[PDB]
Design a protein around this nucleic acid. Structure first.
Ligand SMILES: [Ca+2]
Ligand SMILES: [Ca+2]
Ligand SMILES: [Ca+2]
Ligand SMILES: [K+]
Lengths: 99, 107, 99, 84, 99, 80, 99
DNA sequence: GCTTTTTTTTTTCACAATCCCGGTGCCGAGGCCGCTCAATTGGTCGTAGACAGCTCTAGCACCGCTTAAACGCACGTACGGAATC
């Protein structure tokens, strides 16, 4: 028969991979476009120094990565393995991010 | 004519530091010890990090320190970590850490 | 040739010098050095700021090495604080007697 | 020149799954991905608005890496390795 | 005439009662002694202004009430009504008062 | 000197009432106590550090208030 | 003969003045007054510091009403910001127009 | 105690991913160098703040009341957490 890893066993592989590495995990252009998309909403016809778009990405990915950390702890607090939007909202509530 | 750093036994520029103090609107007047003390503390903290980063670079069989090495040094060291609690190292990644309950049953 | 690039200061040489005192055979990446530069600048503003406030809270016009010290005690964690307080003190004591 | 598309979707499911891998997450609800985007969006709004203000104050038409950095430090999210 | 409120019913009354009021909930002297006890470990034969002990209490209690609020949510996140050590540790882990 | 026990169960309950808490495990009263201790250490240390820098033997409201602010827990109504 | 209390400033006369504008029949407890006074001082110091950084970031020696405004858009939330700016502008416009 | 079925734990490989080396090539660390501007020296001048002296404030210690609050036990209900689906 064909091989097939049990549900979770690649997920853990992925975890080990991505914690071991430093490379940015969102695709660089879509991020770029999104930044400019959001930029507009405040001021039209604006330029960005790449270094500024990159500094935004580093900062984003970092924020999101920590949020998952806090989130996973909220899931595990509710005797789950599966993160949910209710987990995120708690992290963010406790963090002070939103009310 | 000799450097205030060499007079204090230091690498960091006592003179630069003194100027940044005056010029940074921290106070009207700046004691002559201040930049000597401040420059030394900045040197001590730089050195502490460079020992550790360096070790975590040697560990990786890499001759040059990179951000990862800094991150590993800092995050793995109780105190450095606190000091840099709300700091984000670019290109640093995170410490290998998989919560226990997410591993399968070991034997 | 055209216009030469305007002077941007850095702690880079002083980081290097330090580096070779600690790990001679160890060197350092462009991005790494940028991080060191952020870190030094960071802790400048932190300590300077705390000393500013110390002086101003005591109706002092002067940031002396006393301010820088108390500041460092307020701002550094235990073992880091001590060594800081030593190396600062050492280095003033030397500076003083070398006039 | 041109007004931009609807890009927020470019923060793909793969990417969001990868980021939550870096965070030690093993299993992921279906609903996570869109919720993340909203969070990510609000984050970028908040920083960029602040950055653009630093831009606007300096009367420049080009957001600098330092604008981002100053904003990010304002937001309590201090970033090393891009200046200041 | 053996009249008893069922478990949880005065708890609720209490919650209502104390959210409504502003007075400090820790008895003052014991608090004072604790401050002084902790003070000693840093610098002997200290004194305190009475107002400095009150600022400390106002702060501590406020800290605690708040921490409870977040603890309570973490309880409820695990489908509990009863707050437990682990809830407090999560609250603080997410807040970043400890690792 | 073990004044930490002066932070009674009742007083602890009260605080948690005001936090909208309904039911409380027995192990919390000690957990609370530790937390409360750690908080005070961090605030008092800093406060006294301000005291020693102004060369005094008497801790002032301001000392506290200036510490609390360093600690992000800014306090209104004691001379901010 | 006794005359030893310091002389320490406050915003209390202006808190009272502004109070008699919005509610001329109502007064204010001492503790309330001192919360208000901390309040003003807080926000002073917040606005000022940002404006001090705006300048220093843009290599300028002068905090102007341009920096106060930029700080204010940065430091206050949406609708408060709007009215704060609006009131700021008005006040300055009226002062140029007087002398 | 028997006896069969599940059920648990152990055995035997087959595979797939990961790891590790040497090889190859590219580019950025590293350092040299030449010039500039920012630190240093060596002056003077003013006042910040160290210091001594004094006032008197508010911090400390102790006493004895009268409660309100803590405590410590008796009793049971509703809640947490295991098990099952
Ligand atoms: Ca070494
Ligand atoms: Ca004088
Ligand atoms: Ca149940
Ligand atoms: K006194």
């Amino acid at each position: 028969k064909p091989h097939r890893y049990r549900p979770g066993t690649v997920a853990l592989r992925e975890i080990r991979r991505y914690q071991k590495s430093t490379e940015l995990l969102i695709r660089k252009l879509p991020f770029q476009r999104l930044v400019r998309e959001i930029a507009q909403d405040f001021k039209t016809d604006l330029r960005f120094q790449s270094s500024a778009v990159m500094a935004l990405q580093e900062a984003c990915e970092a924020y999101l990565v920590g949020l998952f950390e806090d989130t996973n702890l909220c899931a595990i607090h509710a005797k789950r393995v599966t993160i949910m939007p209710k987990d995120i909202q708690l992290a963010r509530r406790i963090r002070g991010e939103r009310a | 004519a000799k450097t205030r750093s060499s007079r204090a036994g230091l690498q960091f520029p006592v003179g630069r530091v003194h100027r940044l103090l005056r010029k940074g609107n921290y106070s009207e007047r700046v004691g002559a010890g201040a930049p000597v003390y401040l420059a030394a503390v900045l040197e001590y903290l730089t050195a502490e990090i460079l020992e550790l980063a360096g070790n975590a670079a040697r560990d990786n069989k890499k001759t040059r320190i990179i951000p990862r090495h800094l991150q590993l040094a800092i995050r793995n060291d109780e105190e450095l970590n606190k000091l840099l609690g709300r700091v984000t190292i670019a290109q640093g990644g995170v410490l290998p850490n998989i919560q226990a309950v997410l591993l399968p049953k070991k034997t | 040739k055209k216009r030469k690039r305007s002077r941007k200061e850095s702690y880079s040489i002083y980081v290097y010098k330090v580096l070779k005192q600690v790990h001679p055979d160890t060197g350092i990446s462009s991005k790494a050095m940028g991080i060191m530069n952020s870190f030094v600048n960071d802790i400048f503003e932190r300590i300077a700021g705390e000393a500013s406030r110390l002086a101003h809270y005591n109706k002092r016009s002067t940031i002396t090495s006393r301010e820088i010290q108390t500041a460092v005690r307020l701002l550094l964690p235990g073992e880091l604080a001590k060594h800081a307080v030593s190396e600062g003190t050492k280095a003033v004591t030397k500076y003083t007697s070398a006039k | 020149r041109k007004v931009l598309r609807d890009n927020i979707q470019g923060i793909t499911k793969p990417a969001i799954r990868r980021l939550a891998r870096r965070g030690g997450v093993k299993r992921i609800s279906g609903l996570i991905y869109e919720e993340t985007r909203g969070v990510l969006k609000v984050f970028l709004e908040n920083v960029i608005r602040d950055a653009v203000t630093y831009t606007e104050h300096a009367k420049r038409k080009t957001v600098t890496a330092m604008d981002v950095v100053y904003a990010l430090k304002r937001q309590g999210r201090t970033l090393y390795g891009f200046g200041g």
